[PDB]
Design a binder for this molecule. Sequence first.
Ligand SMILES: COc1ccc(F)cc1C(=O)NCc1ccc(-c2nn([C@@H](C)C(F)(F)F)c(N)c2C(N)=O)cc1
Length: 264
Amino acid sequence: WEIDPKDLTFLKELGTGQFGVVKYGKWRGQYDVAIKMIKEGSMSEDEFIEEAKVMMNLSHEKLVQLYGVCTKQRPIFIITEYMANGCLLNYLREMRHRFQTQQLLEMCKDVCEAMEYLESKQFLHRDLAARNCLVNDQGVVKVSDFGLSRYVLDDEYTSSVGSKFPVRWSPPEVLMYSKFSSKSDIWAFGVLMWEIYSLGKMPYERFTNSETAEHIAQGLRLYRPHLASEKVYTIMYSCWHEKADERPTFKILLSNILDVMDEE
Ligand SMILES: COc1ccc(F)cc1C(=O)NCc1ccc(-c2nn([C@@H](C)C(F)(F)F)c(N)c2C(N)=O)cc1
């Protein structure tokens, strides 16, 4: 799990975010990697380092691989698979100019495969959204930052009443009782399908976070994006049953997605 910084070559800065600056580089001069230089005070570093091996064991082709950490310096670096097309949210917005609707369903299938694998390990993502998915050079969407919110220090992001909490991707039991489960990741997956079919629009854009929480509690749900067929909308809507036990599993969503692919 411990990578020697001597083996990294830094080649270009890709951007920055909540948890630090990201650079593209090579490991041992040969293998592409992305390197995130963790923002001081943003994460519970000792706890993340001890459990970096846990996340490194989650190996599925549709999960962005965590390769290791560099911890013998400040700041700590997190080394991952390089995703040349960057975050899915921005990539959807760029796609508006040139795309086939069948590509949208393939993106949903990629994320659903990763989530079925996490579900099989009873591993909660806790913040599934287009901004936490990445896209590689071949247009494959993969899920990233799985389980990271448990190590975030800022309560504005982790608390269900924090200004920065992902309210628009949360079911009623998370907003009210902070009750996370595989079924809250299912709800967020339905919102992510809506983000894909809306080419990166913000969910519930006319409403504030507090209004959105009330809207959801009243049973109101996102509309069908015009690119989604009624069969696709039925799948995303199935993620939004008020009762968590009524929502499907990722194995069921994957089969439904594969049925629509085989039919349309
Ligand atoms: C799989 O990783 C994890 C799994 C579990 C967990 F709990 C935490 C992590 C984690 O912290 N990973 C560190 C990391 C995260 C995202 C990028 C990245 N970001 N971006 C862009 C948006 C940008 F703009 F930031 F560069 C890429 N293209 C990136 C790229 N990989 O090409 C790089 C490294």
